[PDB]
């Protein structure tokens, strides 16, 4: 019976984001640790479910941490967590996904100062009915009336206002997430979106670029400390993953970065301190195979849609890793003449679009001009 706000949620494989319309503009809401996105990670302890940044950090000590649950959505697969009494609890992807949604909902309410019971949740364009219905159910479990499930590339196009275009547009969306890569071709006409073709690689994402930096640091460690290998040291590995992420981010702004890992372990010889330079050129060399794998899905969607690349009017970049300068160059190489758009934060653009759709569903005509 609610006529209230409809939040927009990007429930990603790797990270999630929540946005809402406020005074005729979409606003991205920060979680309680001040972050505009939240890891799509849930961990389990006795009488306690931990979501987001904290669950990620506690991975070192908690083997009952569930990552990438989106990959199982729409399946009858279960995940297992081990209770302290030695018994096993089976969880559905819906139940785990609901914990993520519940967390987003809870902090959004505290931000907005209002109870929230309505959402738009985004999904990949290739999701079938089972996968869509699983997402709806996760929403229902979290106490959300899921007003609409919309496609992630469609949400991105909504954020850029492409539905308002004066002519029919074909739009390419290049979506490089944390663990998956997706390409979509949309046709937008008379205000409605049609997915013409999709392609991708579900085992290619930003994490893979990070992993090359982890490998690079690990090679250096072995070379400088007589073959020393920390692959089994979970806290060391967590710090290397964190260091790799930071390095990658800095190399999107600068031509070099310093990886700094004081006191990474202690051997019989003494503390191990890593201080290591990585150039953008070397980072690009190490990861060129990953980047080149993004080329083939673009050619595939163009082929499938039966268009010439000149028929693509507009390109959207989605996913934080699209900030890498080498990604921009690749995409430009494949769609000559066109600017890869990332002026809306690619980490946030899908949730923003979902929030816009929420305002539309609510018939909210409040504008910043009023």
UniProtKB/Swiss-Prot annotation:
UniProt entry tagged with the keyword ATP-binding: yes
Provide the GO biological process annotations. Answer: chaperone cofactor-dependent protein refolding; protein refolding
Q: Which residues carry this modification: Phosphothreonine?
A: 180
The UniProt keywords, alphabetically, are: ATP-binding, Chaperone, Nucleotide-binding, Phosphoprotein, Stress response
Induction of expression: By stress conditions e.g. heat shock.
Which GO molecular function annotation, any one, does this entry have?
A: unfolded protein binding
- Which family does the record claim for this protein? Belongs to the heat shock protein 70 family.
Q: What does the record give as the function of this protein? A: Acts as a chaperone.
Q: What is this protein called?
A: Chaperone protein DnaK
Q: Which organism's genome codes for this protein?
A: Mycoplasma genitalium (strain ATCC 33530 / DSM 19775 / NCTC 10195 / G37) (Mycoplasmoides genitalium)
Lineage of origin: Bacteria, Bacillati, Mycoplasmatota, Mycoplasmoidales, Mycoplasmoidaceae
This protein's encoding gene: dnaK
């Amino acid at each position: 019976a609610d006529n209230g706000l409809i939040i927009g949620i990007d429930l990603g494989t790797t990270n999630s984001c929540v946005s809402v319309m406020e005074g005729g503009r979409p606003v991205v809401l920060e979680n309680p640790e001040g972050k505009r996105t939240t890891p799509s990670i849930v961990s389990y302890k006795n009488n306690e479910i931990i979501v987001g940044d904290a669950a990620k950090r506690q991975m070192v000590t908690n083997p009952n941490t569930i990552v990438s649950i989106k990959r199982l959505m729409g399946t009858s697969n279960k995940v297992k967590v081990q209770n302290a009494d030695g018994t096993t609890k089976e969880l559905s992807p819906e139940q785990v996904s609901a914990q993520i949604l519940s967390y987003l909902k809870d902090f959004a309410e505290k931000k907005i100062g209002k109870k929230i019971s309505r959402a738009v949740i985004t999904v990949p364009a290739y999701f079938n009915d089972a996968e869509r219905n699983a997402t709806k159910t996760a929403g229902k479990i979290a106490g959300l009336n899921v007003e609409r499930i919309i496609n992630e590339p469609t949400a991105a196009a909504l954020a850029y206002g492409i539905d308002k275009a004066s002519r029919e547009m074909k739009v390419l969306v290049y979506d490089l997430g944390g663990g998956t890569f997706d390409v979509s071709l949309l046709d937008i006409a008379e205000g409605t979106f049609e997915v013409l073709a999709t392609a991708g690689d579900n085992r290619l994402g930003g994490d893979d670029w990070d992993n090359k930096i982890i490998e690079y640091i690990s090679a250096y460690i072995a070379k400088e400390h007589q073959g020393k290998n920390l692959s089994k040291d979970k806290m060391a590995m967590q710090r290397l993953k964190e260091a790799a992420e930071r390095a990658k981010i800095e190399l999107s702004a600068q031509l070099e970065t310093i990886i700094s890992l004081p006191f990474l372990t202690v051997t019989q010889k003494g503390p191990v301190n890593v201080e290591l330079k990585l150039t953008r050129a070397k980072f690009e060399e190490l990861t060129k195979p990953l980047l080149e794998r993004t080329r083939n899905p673009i050619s595939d969607v163009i082929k499938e849609a039966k268009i010439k690349p000149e028929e693509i009017n507009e390109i959207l970049l989605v996913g934080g890793s699209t900030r890498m300068p080498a990604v921009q160059k690749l995409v430009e190489s494949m769609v000559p003449g066109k600017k890869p758009n990332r002026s809306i934060n690619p980490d946030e653009v899908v949730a923003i679009g979902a929030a816009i759709q929420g305002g539309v569903l609510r018939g909210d005509l409040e504008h910043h001009h009023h």
